[PDB]
Amino acid sequence: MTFAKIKFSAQIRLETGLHIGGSDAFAAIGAIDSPVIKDPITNLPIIPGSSLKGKMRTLLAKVYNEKVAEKPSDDSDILSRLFGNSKDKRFKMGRLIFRDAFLSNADELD
Amino acid sequence: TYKLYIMTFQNAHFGSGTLDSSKLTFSADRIFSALVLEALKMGKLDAFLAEANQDKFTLTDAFPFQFGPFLPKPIGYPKHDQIDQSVDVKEVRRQAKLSKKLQFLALENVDDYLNGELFENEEHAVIDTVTKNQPHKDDNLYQVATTRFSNDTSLYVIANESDLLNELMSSLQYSGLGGKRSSGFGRFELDIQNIPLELSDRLTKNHSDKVMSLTTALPVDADLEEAMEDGHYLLTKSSGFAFSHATNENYRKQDLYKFASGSTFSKTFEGQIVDVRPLDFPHAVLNYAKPLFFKLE
């Protein structure tokens, strides 16, 4: 009925390290390694909300579907209702908004 | 008869009877009314009226001025005595259409056109129409045509060197001329020049030879018959709604048929500052139809 917004706030702690990826646009002159995605200003590693949303949708698609799901637009009611669906007028805008995750314990790490 | 008043325009709308039309050049009645209104609003109306009633006063229709005084095509002188050609009818009709399309000659070649030479028009101004609306009741959509000049084309008028007329001209150059003057259209910048030596000897008021009127003039009844019995001319209507500060409602001022320019006549005549006010209304409307002639060959 009434409008509300619930903000799930958590801290993602890396048990092992994380290679999100991206291309060599912030790669150092001389580095041949595969770079991780970085903030254009602080050059700290980030976790883009696109990767979180994609992996969460792919994982939940093996549990809450009981179908084939050839394409993302074919997902069930329970998943297209949250994560959005481009081929359904009732679920074009999903109820879940992900946000880019930025470093917070840089001081502690130092 | 004395000066060569030039006025550089950038955007102007001289109505031809409807708001959606805009002529290239204004007639002498428009500028005379503008001067009368400027003198009335400044305070010195009677001085300008006394000057205008004198026979020394002169005013001509606006003519184009582009690196040389231009002039009206003489009506009735493509005469076959100097237009006889051996070309086929295709070229004859092409040159007749070109002559009919011509509206303004240059002073450097006026006599050349009288010799039978053929000339073409020149890029002076573009007649464009802009549509505007009234977003107060959201049910209005009007169109105004303008005459934005370019190619460094100005307009010129021939008037006497007088301190009053110069002052009224300088006050008029920041009041605009014709059309929606309080909307952008009509403004100009004044300059005062001397008549070129190839024009002052012909710009006349009195001989008995053939003289092109350079003004939308209406002869008095004494010499009207002699004017049309051996004359070539055109007729123009000076109708309109009389702008006045002493009525809450606009009144159609009396229609008037005047001889346009360049109407050729066998002799000179006298004009009239004619009252065209509707009946029973104290201050009148003055229509200036007074000749300024050009001597020809």
Binding site: - | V89, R93, M228, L235, R252
Partner: protein, 505 residues
């Protein structure tokens, strides 16, 4: 007189005025013939207010000519003031100068010439001292005017609007255009002449009215009533205010704009005067050949144009002699212009060409402004050595055959075939294409670079199945852009027409 209308309802007044002036010219011819005791056989040509007679050279004929001249000019001064003026001329000629063994081609033309010079002289010097002294008498205190032609004579109230007697007559006559029979009464109807008025009345009512002459419009059948047959171009698909909405198709495609076409055949007068003198060393110049040329021109431009307008959303306001004026949906208007000239070229065997101007306008625009802009475009087309078409601007002036062969069915067809298979991004790239086309002169080589980039980026964006057709279009458009300015302008016009066709708004 026809095109000066300032208010809504301009449509009906416009068509009624066109038909009314045509009928006034017809009545001038008929009454002049009746005063001379002749008939329509002596009539060589009536059209556009221009008419020619062949009469007997006698002092009586000259006196009736000048008397009818004075009478009809007095009537026109009484009703239309100085707006309309009839001028008569006549040139005396002998039999010898119309043969082929005795006519001199100079003499042939000279026959017609004198009359033209006299008409021009009478047109230059119009009114005597009495007439202008009377017209300048003033003395009228009027606060309101007519809202259509701005007349002040005999204002009456109609639909909460002030109109003159003539405007009221055209208001009435616009509803009576749909009838086929038009009668000349003494007092009822629009004043067509001295003590004579025109009134369009249906057939079943014709027995209840007192008339002197009956005209039948667009009918080749000899009916029960002895009438004179006249032909006009009067196809009307719908009301003029609806053609803006009619441009849209069933799917909503098409700009909500109307168009006006003005078309003119070049050198028609030179065609009349010396078109036949080029062959046979001038022996083919007889009145018979000019008369059948007049009849062929009337056949093409008064009845055949009605079939050229068939099934099209347009109205032919004025079609007589050489001037054609039509208003409609822009697609049907341009279509009709193309078909009319193709059939004119086929009709005249390529001897006479046409110059056309097609102005594009919005809904509710004043009709006088419409006619003025379209005539300006027509004149701009006339300036391009004639045989030219000016579409929506003096900038897009093309040779007419080039317009048909290159613009409409060559570039526009390929642009349609391509972009009908494309999504929103490709259709949006048309605006970048047009902008590159317009800016070419300033930055020539940088612009050809930019165009190459845009074409191949859309190459890379096109699906694999549709890639090859894109390669074809990219090569063809690059060839158009780098060939010359003529193909550049033609491609720009084709893109403009296509973006007009697909517009959703």
């Amino acid at each position: 007189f026809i095109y000066n209308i300032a208010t809504s309802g301009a449509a009906k007044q416009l068509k009624a005025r066109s038909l009314y002036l045509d009928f006034m010219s017809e009545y001038i011819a008929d009454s002049l013939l009746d005063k001379l005791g002749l008939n329509r056989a002596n009539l060589l040509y009536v059209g556009g207010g221009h008419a020619y007679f062949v009469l007997a050279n006698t002092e009586k004929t000259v006196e009736t000519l000048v008397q009818f001249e004075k009478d009809f000019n007095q009537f026109l001064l009484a009703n239309f003031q100085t707006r309309l003026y009839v001028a008569f001329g006549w040139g005396s000629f002998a039999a010898k100068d119309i043969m082929s063994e005795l006519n001199s081609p100079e003499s042939y033309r000279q026959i017609y010439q004198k009359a033209s010079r006299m008409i021009s002289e009478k047109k230059i010097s119009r009114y005597d001292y009495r007439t202008l002294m009377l017209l300048n008498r003033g003395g009228k205190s009027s606060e309101r005017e007519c809202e259509i032609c701005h007349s002040v004579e005999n204002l009456v109230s109609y639909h909460d609007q002030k109109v003159c007697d003539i405007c009221r007559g055209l208001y009435q006559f616009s509803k009576e255009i749909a009838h086929d029979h038009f009668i000349i009464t003494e007092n009822e109807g629009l004043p067509i002449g001295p003590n004579a008025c025109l009134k369009g009345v249906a057939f079943e009512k014709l027995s209840q009215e007192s008339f002197s002459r009956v005209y039948v419009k667009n009918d080749y059948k000899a009916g029960t009533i002895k009438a004179t047959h006249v032909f006009v171009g009067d196809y009307q698909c719908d009301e003029i205010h609806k053609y803006a909405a009619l441009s849209k198709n069933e799917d909503g495609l098409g700009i909500k704009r109307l168009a006006v076409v003005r078309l003119d055949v070049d050198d028609l007068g030179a065609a009349f005067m010396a078109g036949f003198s080029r062959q046979g060393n001038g022996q083919y110049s007889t009145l018979s050949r000019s008369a059948t040329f007049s009849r062929s021109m009337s056949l093409f431009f008064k009845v055949y144009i009605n079939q050229f307008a068939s099934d099209k959303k347009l109205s032919i306001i004025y079609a007589g002699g050489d001037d054609v004026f039509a208003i409609g949906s822009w697609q049907d208007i341009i279509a009709f212009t193309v078909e009319l000239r193709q059939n004119f070229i086929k009709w005249t065997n390529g001897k006479l060409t046409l110059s056309a101007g097609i102005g594009l306008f919005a809904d509710k625009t004043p009709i006088s402004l419409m006619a003025h802009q379209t005539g300006e475009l027509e004149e701009a087309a006339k300036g391009n050595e004639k045989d030219s078409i000016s579409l929506f601007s003096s900038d897009y002036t093309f040779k007419f055959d080039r317009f048909i062969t290159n613009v409409y069915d060559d570039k526009l067809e390929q642009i349609r075939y391509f972009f009908n298979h494309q999504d929103e991004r490709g259709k949006n790239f048309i605006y970048k294409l047009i902008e590159l086309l317009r800016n070419y002169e300033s930055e020539e080589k940088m612009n050809v670079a930019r165009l190459a980039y845009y074409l191949t980026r859309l190459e890379e964006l096109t699906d694999k199945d549709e890639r090859d057709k894109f390669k074809q279009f990219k090569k063809l458009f690059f060839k158009w852009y780098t060939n010359n300015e003529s193909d550049r302008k033609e491609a720009e016009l084709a893109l403009l027409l296509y973006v007009y066709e697909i517009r959703k708004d």
